[PDB]
Coordinates of C-alpha atoms (C1' of nucleotides) and ligand atoms in Angstrom, one line a residue:
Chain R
X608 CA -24.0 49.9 -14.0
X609 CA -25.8 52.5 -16.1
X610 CA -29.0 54.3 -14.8
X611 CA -32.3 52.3 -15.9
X612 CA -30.4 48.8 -15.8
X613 CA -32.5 47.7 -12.5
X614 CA -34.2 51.7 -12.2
X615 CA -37.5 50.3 -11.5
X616 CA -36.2 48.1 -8.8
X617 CA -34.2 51.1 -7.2
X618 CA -36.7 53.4 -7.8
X619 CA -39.3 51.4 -6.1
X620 CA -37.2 50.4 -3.0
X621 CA -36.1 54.8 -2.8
X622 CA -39.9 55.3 -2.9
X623 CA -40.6 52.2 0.2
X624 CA -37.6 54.0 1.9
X625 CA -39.2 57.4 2.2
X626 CA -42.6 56.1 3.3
X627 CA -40.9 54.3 5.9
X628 CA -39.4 57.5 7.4
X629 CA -41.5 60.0 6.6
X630 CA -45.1 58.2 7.5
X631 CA -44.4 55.3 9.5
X632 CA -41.8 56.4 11.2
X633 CA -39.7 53.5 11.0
X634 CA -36.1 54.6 10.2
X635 CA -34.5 51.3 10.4
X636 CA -36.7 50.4 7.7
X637 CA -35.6 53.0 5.9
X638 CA -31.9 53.0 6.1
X639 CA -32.9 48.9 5.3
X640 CA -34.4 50.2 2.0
X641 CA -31.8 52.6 1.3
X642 CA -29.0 49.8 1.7
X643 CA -30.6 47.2 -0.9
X644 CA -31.4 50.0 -3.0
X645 CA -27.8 50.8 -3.1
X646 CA -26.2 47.2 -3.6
X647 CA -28.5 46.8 -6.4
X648 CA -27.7 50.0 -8.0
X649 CA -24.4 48.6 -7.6
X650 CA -25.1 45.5 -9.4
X651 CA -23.6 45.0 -12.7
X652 CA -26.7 42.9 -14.5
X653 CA -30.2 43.2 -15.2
X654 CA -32.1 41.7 -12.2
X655 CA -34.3 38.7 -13.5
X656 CA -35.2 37.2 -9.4
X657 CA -36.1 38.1 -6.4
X658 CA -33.4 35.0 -5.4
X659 CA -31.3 36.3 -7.7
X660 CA -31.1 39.4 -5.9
X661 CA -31.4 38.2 -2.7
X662 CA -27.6 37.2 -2.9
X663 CA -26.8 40.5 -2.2
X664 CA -26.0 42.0 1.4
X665 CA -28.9 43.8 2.6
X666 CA -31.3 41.9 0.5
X667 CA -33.7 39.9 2.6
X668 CA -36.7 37.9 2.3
X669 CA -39.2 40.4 1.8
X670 CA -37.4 42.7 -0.8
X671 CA -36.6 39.7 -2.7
X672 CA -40.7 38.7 -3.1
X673 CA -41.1 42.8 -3.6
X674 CA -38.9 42.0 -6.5
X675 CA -40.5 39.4 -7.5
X676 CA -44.1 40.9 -7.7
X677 CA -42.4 43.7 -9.5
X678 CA -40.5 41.6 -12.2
X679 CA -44.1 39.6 -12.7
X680 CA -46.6 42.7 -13.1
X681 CA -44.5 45.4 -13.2
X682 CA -45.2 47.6 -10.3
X683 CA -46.2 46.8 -6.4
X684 CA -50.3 46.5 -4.9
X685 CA -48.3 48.0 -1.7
X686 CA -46.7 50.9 -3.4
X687 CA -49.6 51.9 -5.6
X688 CA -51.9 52.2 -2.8
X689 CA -49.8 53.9 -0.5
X690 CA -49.5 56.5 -3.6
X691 CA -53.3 57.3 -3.9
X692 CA -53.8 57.5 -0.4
X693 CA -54.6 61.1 0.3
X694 CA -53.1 61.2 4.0
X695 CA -49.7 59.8 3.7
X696 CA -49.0 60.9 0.2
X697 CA -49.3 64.3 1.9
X698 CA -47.3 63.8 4.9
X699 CA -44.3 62.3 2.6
X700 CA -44.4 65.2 0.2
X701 CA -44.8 68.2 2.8
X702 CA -41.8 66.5 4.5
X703 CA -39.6 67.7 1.3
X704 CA -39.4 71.0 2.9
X705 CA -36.5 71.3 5.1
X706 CA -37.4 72.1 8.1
X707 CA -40.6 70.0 7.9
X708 CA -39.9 66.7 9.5
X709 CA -41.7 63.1 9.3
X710 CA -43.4 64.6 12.9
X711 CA -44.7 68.0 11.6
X712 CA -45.7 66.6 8.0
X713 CA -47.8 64.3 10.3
X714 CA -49.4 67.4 12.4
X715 CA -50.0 69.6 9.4
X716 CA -52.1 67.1 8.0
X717 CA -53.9 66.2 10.8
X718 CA -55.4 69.8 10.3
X719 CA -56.2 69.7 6.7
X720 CA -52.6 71.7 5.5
X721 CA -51.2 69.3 2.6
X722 CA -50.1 71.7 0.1
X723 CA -47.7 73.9 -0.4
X724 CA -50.3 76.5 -1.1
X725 CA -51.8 75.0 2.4
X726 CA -48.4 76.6 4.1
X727 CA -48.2 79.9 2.5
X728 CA -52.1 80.1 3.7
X729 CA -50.8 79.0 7.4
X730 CA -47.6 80.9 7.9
X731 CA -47.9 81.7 11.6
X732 CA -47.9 77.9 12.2
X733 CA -44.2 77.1 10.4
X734 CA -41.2 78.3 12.4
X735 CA -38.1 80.3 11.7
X736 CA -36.5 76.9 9.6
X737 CA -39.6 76.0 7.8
X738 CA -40.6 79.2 6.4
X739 CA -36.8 79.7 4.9
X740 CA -37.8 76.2 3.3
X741 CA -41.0 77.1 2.3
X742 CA -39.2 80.2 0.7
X743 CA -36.8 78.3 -1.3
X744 CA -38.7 75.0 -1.8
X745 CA -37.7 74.7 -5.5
X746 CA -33.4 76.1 -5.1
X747 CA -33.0 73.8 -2.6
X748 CA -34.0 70.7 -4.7
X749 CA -31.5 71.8 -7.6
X750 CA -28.4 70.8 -7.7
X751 CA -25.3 73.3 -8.2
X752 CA -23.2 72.9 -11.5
X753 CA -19.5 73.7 -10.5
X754 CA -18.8 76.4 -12.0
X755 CA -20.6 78.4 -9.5
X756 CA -19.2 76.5 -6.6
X757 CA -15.5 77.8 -7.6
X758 CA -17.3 81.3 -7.8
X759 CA -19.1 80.5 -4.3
X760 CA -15.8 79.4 -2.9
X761 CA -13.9 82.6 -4.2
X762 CA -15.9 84.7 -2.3
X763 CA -16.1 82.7 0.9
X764 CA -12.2 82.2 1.1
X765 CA -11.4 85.9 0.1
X766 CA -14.4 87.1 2.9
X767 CA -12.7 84.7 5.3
X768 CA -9.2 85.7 4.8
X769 CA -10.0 89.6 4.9
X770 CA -11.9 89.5 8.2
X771 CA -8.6 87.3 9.7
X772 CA -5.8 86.1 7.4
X773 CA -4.5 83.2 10.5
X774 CA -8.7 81.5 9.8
X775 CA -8.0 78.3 7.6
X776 CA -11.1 77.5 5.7
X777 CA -11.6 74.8 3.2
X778 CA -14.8 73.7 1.0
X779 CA -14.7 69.8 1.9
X780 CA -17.7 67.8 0.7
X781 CA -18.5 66.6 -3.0
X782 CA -17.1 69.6 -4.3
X783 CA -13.5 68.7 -3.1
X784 CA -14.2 65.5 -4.4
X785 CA -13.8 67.3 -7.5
X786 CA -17.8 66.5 -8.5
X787 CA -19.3 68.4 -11.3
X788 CA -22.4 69.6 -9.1
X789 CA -22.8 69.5 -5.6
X790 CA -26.3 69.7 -3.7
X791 CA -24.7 72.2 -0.8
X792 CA -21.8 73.8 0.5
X793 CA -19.8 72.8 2.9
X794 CA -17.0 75.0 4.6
X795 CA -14.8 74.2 7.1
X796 CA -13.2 77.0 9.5
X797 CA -10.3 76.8 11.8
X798 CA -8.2 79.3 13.7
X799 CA -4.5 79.1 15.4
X800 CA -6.3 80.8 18.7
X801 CA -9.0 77.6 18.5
X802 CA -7.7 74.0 20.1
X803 CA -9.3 71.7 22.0
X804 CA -7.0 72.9 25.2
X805 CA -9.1 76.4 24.8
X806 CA -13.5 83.6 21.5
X807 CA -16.0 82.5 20.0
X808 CA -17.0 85.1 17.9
X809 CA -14.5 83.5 15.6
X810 CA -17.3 81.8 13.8
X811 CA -19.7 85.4 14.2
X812 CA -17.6 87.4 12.0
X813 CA -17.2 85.2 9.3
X814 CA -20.9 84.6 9.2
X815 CA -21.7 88.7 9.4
X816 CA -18.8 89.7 6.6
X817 CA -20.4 87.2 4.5
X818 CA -23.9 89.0 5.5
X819 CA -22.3 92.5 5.1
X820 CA -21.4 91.7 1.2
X821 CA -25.1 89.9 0.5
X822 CA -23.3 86.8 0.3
X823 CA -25.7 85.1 3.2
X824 CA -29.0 85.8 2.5
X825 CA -31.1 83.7 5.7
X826 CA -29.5 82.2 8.5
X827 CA -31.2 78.6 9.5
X828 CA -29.3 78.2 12.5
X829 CA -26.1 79.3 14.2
X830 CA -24.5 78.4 17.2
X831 CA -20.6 79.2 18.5
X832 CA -19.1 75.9 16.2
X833 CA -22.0 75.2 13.5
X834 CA -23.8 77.8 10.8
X835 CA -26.6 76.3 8.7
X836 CA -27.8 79.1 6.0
X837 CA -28.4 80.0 3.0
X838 CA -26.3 82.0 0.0
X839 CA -26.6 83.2 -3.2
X840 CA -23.8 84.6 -6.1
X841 CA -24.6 88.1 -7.2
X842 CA -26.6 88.6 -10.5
X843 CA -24.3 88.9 -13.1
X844 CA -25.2 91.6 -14.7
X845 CA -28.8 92.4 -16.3
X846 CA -29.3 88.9 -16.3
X847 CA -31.6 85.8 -14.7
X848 CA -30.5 85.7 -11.3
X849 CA -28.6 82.5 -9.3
X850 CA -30.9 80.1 -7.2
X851 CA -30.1 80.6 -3.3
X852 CA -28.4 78.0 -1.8
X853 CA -27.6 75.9 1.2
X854 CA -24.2 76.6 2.9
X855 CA -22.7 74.8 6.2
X856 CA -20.2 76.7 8.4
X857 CA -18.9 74.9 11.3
X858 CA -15.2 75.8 13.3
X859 CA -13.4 73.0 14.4
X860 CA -10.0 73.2 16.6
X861 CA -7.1 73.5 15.0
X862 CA -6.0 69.9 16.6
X863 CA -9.1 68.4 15.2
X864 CA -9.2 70.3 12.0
X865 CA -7.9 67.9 9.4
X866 CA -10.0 64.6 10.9
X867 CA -13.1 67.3 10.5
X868 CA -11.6 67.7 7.2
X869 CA -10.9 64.1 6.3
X870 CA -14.5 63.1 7.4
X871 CA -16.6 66.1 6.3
X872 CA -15.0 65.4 2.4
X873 CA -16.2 61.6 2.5
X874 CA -17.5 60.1 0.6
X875 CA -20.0 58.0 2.8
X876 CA -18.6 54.6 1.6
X877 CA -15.1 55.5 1.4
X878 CA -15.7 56.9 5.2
X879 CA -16.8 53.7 6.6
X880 CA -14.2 51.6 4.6
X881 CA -11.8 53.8 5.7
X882 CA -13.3 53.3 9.3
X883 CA -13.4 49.7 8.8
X884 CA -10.1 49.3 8.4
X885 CA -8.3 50.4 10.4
X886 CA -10.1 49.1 12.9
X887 CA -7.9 45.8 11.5
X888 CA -5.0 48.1 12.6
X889 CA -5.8 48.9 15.8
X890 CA -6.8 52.4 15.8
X891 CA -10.3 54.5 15.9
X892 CA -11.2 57.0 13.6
X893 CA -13.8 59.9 14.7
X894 CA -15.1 63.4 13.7
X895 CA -12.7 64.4 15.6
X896 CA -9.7 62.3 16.2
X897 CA -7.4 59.0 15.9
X898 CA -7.4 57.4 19.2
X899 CA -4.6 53.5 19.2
X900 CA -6.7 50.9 21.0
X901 CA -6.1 49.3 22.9
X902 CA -5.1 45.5 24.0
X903 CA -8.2 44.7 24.9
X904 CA -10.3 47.4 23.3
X905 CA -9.6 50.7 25.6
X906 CA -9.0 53.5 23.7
X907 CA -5.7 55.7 24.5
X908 CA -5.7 59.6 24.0
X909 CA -6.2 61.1 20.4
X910 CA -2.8 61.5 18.3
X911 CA -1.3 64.3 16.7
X912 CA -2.8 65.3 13.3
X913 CA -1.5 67.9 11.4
X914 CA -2.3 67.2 7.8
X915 CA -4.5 64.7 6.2
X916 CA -1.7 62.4 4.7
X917 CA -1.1 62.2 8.7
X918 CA -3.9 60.2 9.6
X919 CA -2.6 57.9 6.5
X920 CA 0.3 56.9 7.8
X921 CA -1.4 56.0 11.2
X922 CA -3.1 53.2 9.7
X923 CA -0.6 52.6 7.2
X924 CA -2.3 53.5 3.8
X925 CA -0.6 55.6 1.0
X926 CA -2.2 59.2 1.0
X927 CA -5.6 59.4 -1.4
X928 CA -6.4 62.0 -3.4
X929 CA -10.3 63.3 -2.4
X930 CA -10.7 63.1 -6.3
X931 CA -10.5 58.7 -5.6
X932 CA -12.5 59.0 -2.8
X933 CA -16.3 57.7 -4.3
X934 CA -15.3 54.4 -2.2
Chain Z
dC105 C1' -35.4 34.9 19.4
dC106 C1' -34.2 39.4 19.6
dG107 C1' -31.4 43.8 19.7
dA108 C1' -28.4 46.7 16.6
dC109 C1' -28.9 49.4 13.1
dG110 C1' -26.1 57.1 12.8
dT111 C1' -24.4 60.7 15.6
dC112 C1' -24.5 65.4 17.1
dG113 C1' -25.3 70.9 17.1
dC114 C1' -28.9 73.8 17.3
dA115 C1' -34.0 75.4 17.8
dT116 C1' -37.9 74.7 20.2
dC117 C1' -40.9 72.2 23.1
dA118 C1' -42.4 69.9 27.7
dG119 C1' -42.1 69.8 32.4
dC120 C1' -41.0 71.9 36.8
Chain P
dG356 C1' -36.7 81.1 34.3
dC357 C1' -34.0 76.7 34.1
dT358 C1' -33.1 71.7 32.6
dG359 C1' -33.9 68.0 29.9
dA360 C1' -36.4 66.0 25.9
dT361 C1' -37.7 66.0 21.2
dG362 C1' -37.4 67.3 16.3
dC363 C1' -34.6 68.3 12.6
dG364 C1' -30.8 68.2 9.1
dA365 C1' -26.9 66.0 7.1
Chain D
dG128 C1' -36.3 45.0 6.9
dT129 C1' -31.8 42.6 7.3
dC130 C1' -28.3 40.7 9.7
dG131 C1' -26.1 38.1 13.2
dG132 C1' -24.7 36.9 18.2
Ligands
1FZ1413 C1 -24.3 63.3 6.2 C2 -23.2 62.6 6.3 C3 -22.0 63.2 5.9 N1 -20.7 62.5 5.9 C4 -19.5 63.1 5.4 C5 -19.3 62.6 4.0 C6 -20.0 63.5 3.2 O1 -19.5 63.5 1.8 C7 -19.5 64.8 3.9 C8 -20.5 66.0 3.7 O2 -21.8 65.6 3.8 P1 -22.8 65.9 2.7 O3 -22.8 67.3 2.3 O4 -24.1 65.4 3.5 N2 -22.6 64.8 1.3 P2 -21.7 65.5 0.0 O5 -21.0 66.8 0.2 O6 -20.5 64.4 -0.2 O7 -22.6 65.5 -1.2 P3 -23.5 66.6 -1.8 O8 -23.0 67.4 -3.0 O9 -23.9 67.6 -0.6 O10 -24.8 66.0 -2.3 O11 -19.6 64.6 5.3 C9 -20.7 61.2 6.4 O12 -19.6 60.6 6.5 N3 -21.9 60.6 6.9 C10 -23.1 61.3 6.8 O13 -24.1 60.6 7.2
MN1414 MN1 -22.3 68.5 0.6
MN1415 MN1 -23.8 69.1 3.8
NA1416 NA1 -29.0 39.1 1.1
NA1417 NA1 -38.0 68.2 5.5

DNA sequence: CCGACGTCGCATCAGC
DNA sequence: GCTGATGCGA
DNA sequence: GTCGG
């Protein structure tokens, strides 16, 4: 599949998707959307039905006559009137800063604030988490090549190990995937002190030493097991400076460590086929742990992970590389 | 026909 | 002031 | 909106 092979058809069903969530509220409609979006993007041919298409899981009645109508005149009465209207236009774009949810969008418009110019007038009225998105509307929307992810990672793992040399920490997500960009960080944090059985400050002085050398320039939220923040790579010289990005912390116990790992490095897809079986097999995969059902369906306590490759051999599958993990 | 469909940590709100 | 509910991101 | 018990 290459990008514009069914684009329009995609990119109409991405655009009903965020309507759905962000101004109707309707998040089952969304993640509906979001699914037939996907299987067509999937699709190896050029669409010509809305039967056609309708062969596909996730693919109902009324996307299939969406199709249709967009096939025949080449765009959607629907779509194009949700677009000019002034209201919920407004409420689906203001939700593209994080912080600003399909509830606050709805609020802000309510009272004439539909801009972005409209929130830097109205700053009292945005909390701690909106005005950091307000702040970096446009970094957080790019995505980060990975060159400066290696550099972002160099400085996390040497920070980490210098505060503690016992912390394990490990950049999961895309980027272990081996990606080429990634659209945040993700770092996972453990500690030979931290099981389930069992300070937590163990996750306060990684975030401060990464404060203390500019690495973390806002904090979004922190708690005693999950950072959300932002970072940013110092300016290399007398040159254009690094967009500031978003970077997840979270500590995990040491016993759950490597299913955090496992799951937090995905992808999505290969997560729930991975999931999925194994069900076949008897066995539950969480977050957290692998717990053996079960003769008639009552889990037993979680097993003993100690690697990856360990929760592998559970369910009897050779150990995959995260760079084969995109299903 | 009709309910499931993604869950959980943290920030802030609503109610007492 | 405390407890639970709601909004949010991912 | 789609699927399925
Ligand atoms: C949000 C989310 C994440 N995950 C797992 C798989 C994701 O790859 C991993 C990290 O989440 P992410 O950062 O939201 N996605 P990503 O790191 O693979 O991609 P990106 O570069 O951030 O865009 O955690 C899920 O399995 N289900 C989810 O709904
Ligand atoms: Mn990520
Ligand atoms: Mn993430
Ligand atoms: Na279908
Ligand atoms: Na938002």
């Amino acid at each position: 599949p290459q990008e514009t092979l069914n684009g329009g058809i995609t990119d109409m069903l991405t655009e009903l998707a965020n309507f759905e969530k962000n101004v109707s509220q309707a998040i089952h409609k969304y993640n509906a959307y979001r699914k037939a979006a996907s299987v067509i993007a999937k699709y190896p041919h050029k669409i010509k039905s809305g039967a056609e298409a309708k062969k596909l899981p996730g693919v109902g009645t009324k996307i299939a006559e969406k199709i249709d109508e967009f096939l025949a005149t080449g765009k959607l009465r629907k779509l194009e009137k949700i677009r000019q209207d002034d209201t919920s236009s407004s409420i689906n774009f203001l939700t593209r800063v994080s912080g600003i949810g399909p509830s606050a969008a709805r609020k802000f418009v309510d009272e004439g604030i539909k801009t972005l110019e409209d929130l830097r007038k109205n700053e009292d009225k945005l909390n701690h988490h909106q005005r950091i998105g307000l702040k970096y509307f446009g970094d957080f929307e790019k995505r980060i090549p990975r060159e400066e992810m290696l550099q972002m990672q160099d400085i996390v793992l040497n920070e980490v190990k210098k505060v503690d040399s016992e912390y394990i920490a490990t950049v999961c997500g895309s980027f272990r995937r081996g990606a080429e960009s990634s659209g945040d960080m993700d770092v996972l944090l453990t500690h030979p002190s931290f099981t389930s059985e069992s300070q937590p400050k163990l996750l306060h002085q990684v975030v401060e030493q990464l404060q203390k050398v500019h690495f973390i320039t806002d904090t979004l939220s922190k708690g005693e097991t999950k950072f959300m923040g932002v970072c940013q790579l110092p300016s290399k010289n007398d040159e254009k400076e690094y967009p500031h990005r978003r970077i997840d912390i979270r500590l995990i116990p040491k016993d759950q460590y490597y299913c955090g790992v496992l799951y937090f490095t995905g992808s999505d897809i290969f997560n729930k086929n991975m999931r999925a079986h194994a069900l076949e097999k008897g066995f539950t995969i969480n977050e957290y742990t692998i717990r053996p059902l079960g003769v008639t369906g009552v889990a037993g306590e979680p097993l003993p992970v100690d690697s990856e490759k360990d929760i592998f051999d559970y369910i009897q599958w050779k150990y995959r590389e995260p760079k084969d993990r995109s299903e």
